[PDB]
Amino acid sequence: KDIDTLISNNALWSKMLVEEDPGFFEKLAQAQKPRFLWIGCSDSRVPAERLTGLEPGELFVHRNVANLVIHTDLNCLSVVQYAVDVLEVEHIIICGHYGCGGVQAAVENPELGLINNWLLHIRDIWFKHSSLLGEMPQERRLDTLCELNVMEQVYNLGHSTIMQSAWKRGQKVTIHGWAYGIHDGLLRDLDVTATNRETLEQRYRHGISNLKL
Amino acid sequence: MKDIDTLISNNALWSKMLVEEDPGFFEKLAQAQKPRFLWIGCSDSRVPAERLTGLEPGELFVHRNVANLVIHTDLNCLSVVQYAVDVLEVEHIIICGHYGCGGVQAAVENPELGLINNWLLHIRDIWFKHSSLLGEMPQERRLDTLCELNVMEQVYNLGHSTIMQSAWKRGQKVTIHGWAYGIHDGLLRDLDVTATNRETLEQRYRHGISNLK
Amino acid sequence: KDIDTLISNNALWSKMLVEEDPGFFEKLAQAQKPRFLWIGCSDSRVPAERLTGLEPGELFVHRNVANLVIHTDLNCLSVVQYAVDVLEVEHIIICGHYGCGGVQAAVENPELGLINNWLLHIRDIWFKHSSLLGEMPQERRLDTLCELNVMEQVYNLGHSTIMQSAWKRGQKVTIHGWAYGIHDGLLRDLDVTATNRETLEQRYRHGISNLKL
Amino acid sequence: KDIDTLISNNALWSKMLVEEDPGFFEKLAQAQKPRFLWIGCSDSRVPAERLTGLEPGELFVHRNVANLVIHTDLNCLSVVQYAVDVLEVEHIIICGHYGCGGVQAAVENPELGLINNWLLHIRDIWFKHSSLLGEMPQERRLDTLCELNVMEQVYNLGHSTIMQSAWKRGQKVTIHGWAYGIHDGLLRDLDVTATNRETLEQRYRHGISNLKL
Ligand SMILES: [Zn+2]
Ligand SMILES: [Zn+2]
Ligand SMILES: [Zn+2]
Ligand SMILES: [Zn+2]
């Protein structure tokens, strides 16, 4: 595939739609305001639209390596603030994927360059739950950390001032932590769904303790 | 409206159906080698990149922020690019904006939106930098032009970072492209700033500005 | 001078104070809510307290390479927000210094590594005012860019949501741009002092115009 | 407004030295690359030069709220990289101060605005050592967290790619964690002094283990 190859595909796809529904493009124009925010990995092993059946225009999408929500990352925080405060999305979905290249690179700690500093936030989670992962067999640890990371990012997101402000002013926003595998593409709900400050805590604590079993 | 239960249910159906049609599809994902493209696009994601370009899941490293910015000091985007260029060894990086972007329009109309306004100040800087150009055009012909100007500047910024400069200096083949598409037809317009090294990055940028003037 | 020296120097200074001035720690003990924010260079060739004769406790200080105020740097912005909104500072001073290593590295562009990306914000100021620097004598260009850099950061500071919100709610905050030389330690006022949105605009443009002469 | 007060003090202080000690400006004019990097709190209750008796020019200084070293803060990381790779400092000192306003705000968690997101990195420390702080009387927790934060930031600093790359190339760099009180200004060495990755690990664990009793 070269750049020209992708360009030609774009023109064809454009023509095909006009022939079938020349009003489609019109539709998107007036497609309201997205009601969901997708925070996913830059791997994008399966795009969010195929996984969820969501159409172009009802998804606000941000993607970074290993789908992180760092307390001081203005990139992700600007997305969250713009979605929550301006677009007023009602659901924020943090979704990781088993086999993530970033999560595994975090654990094996190879000299990869600038990215290693970003992956240290995941390694912090690795050691934070050093006990929990210890109770599990080695093979099932890299997948569990992937679920552990997603729960942590939600916790973080719920602690940021953007989310805390919305919940205190009564805005209806709900945070969800999901994961899917390339073995079946099936979304697994990690059960950390939060709608206010108190549920964020209880969900996170119960999420971790439930993994102990 | 559409709820979470719909998305979860859509996923289970889509998953089983695929097993029915191509049970090897999920195996392909694995075999799929490292991606070859980095897609830096807006969080609006009015049309997902995979449909616009006909690229299937696994051939795209995807990053999205408000108005697809490449700020010199944003570790988020820079970590993505470095992982793509140095670890994944992508050979094409595509920065793609879209006419009608809410962020670019918010930059120009300057409403009090909160935290996001600071992120958009990088666009207002692009507004005044080419304040002369925009004056020569009719008002209608400005909001689309800034959208194209912003994408060219981000392509410029990307090429000036140490990650790109180091890769080009060590002879690695990476090519940066600046595109835009409209929601009226979905046709990608190549902004003609395609760069393959330090000299081309300047020459094309030099070439770009003058033709738009 | 080594580490052991610094520890020993501290112990002497500690008792000497107890012996000579036991009230020094009494002043430090009281509230001493600061009224000034110092945004300066990490070079710190002359500490801010020595330049201004300010006593310990009345200075909130942030320092980075070449005293930058980037729109998307949560570090600098959090200091300013804590100063303006919590500490209620009435003056913010952005101060550069002639001979700055960062300003010199920005222009000569050596391959220094990660720092080069931070310094790219300065090269933006170098080309933005390429007109001014060309008309001036060669020797006085690096000193002028140092003055240009300080004026731009004051401009950026006034554009942030923190300052715009405070001025819009009537809070008394005043931003100043200064510079000092290593030949005499004399502070030069760059005359871009802003107290509101309107003063920020004219003062900026104003500041630039006399340098053209 | 006391800007005029500060302005005259400079001019006064400037002539005073020029008349009395014209070499003060000669020493500062001498190209003395610093040997120490100071990462301290923006409170700057006692300036670093007064605490250590260090004279102008041998101190590279960075200050943020509660002297944090975040894995993804390019501000602090650009300072560290420039010091270690360009200036080749031989010592980095992370110094907190008991009674720090930021450390206290993290624990009491008042709604202060944007700064609260920065302080969540400290709240991370507070809950990470929930066991240790729990075993101590309430009165001795805010001071302990202050020492805990300094150990963690030294831990974070030693894990960054800048330090890891520098140590692996054989460069001599040493990280130190200190604290001082407003009651006496006496530096207490927290005993986390690291010269390589292995010592950083052992130092950190022993630091936490010693606090247990
Ligand atoms: Zn991934
Ligand atoms: Zn957009
Ligand atoms: Zn400097
Ligand atoms: Zn403090």
Numbering used by the authors:
A (entry chain B), C (entry chain D), D (entry chain A): 2 to 214
B (entry chain C): 1 to 213
Authors' account:
Here, we report a case of persistent CA2 contamination that crystallized in three forms. Two are new crystal forms and the third yielded a high-resolution (1.43 Å) structure of a common CA2 crystal form. We report two novel crystal forms of E. coli CA2 that was obtained as a purification contaminant. These lattice parameters can be added to the list of crystal forms of CA2, saving time in the case of contamination. Sometimes, as was the case for the data sets resulting from CA2 crystal forms 4 and 5, there is no match for the cell and symmetry in the PDB. The fortuitous discovery of a CA2 crystal in the previously characterized form 2 from the same protein sample revealed the contaminant. Additionally, we report two additional CA2 structures in new crystal forms, which may save time when others encounter the same problem.
Carbonic anhydrase (EC 4.2.1.1) is a zinc-dependent metalloenzyme that forms carbonic acid from CO2, a byproduct of carbohydrate and fat catabolism. An endogenous carbonic anhydrase frequently contaminates recombinant proteins from E. coli expression systems. Here, the serendipitous discovery of two novel crystal forms and one new, high-resolution structure of carbonic anhydrase 2 (CA2) from Escherichia coli that arose during a crystallization campaign for an un­related target is reported. The presumed Zn2+ ion is coordinated with tetrahedral geometry by Cys42, Asp44, His98 and Cys101.
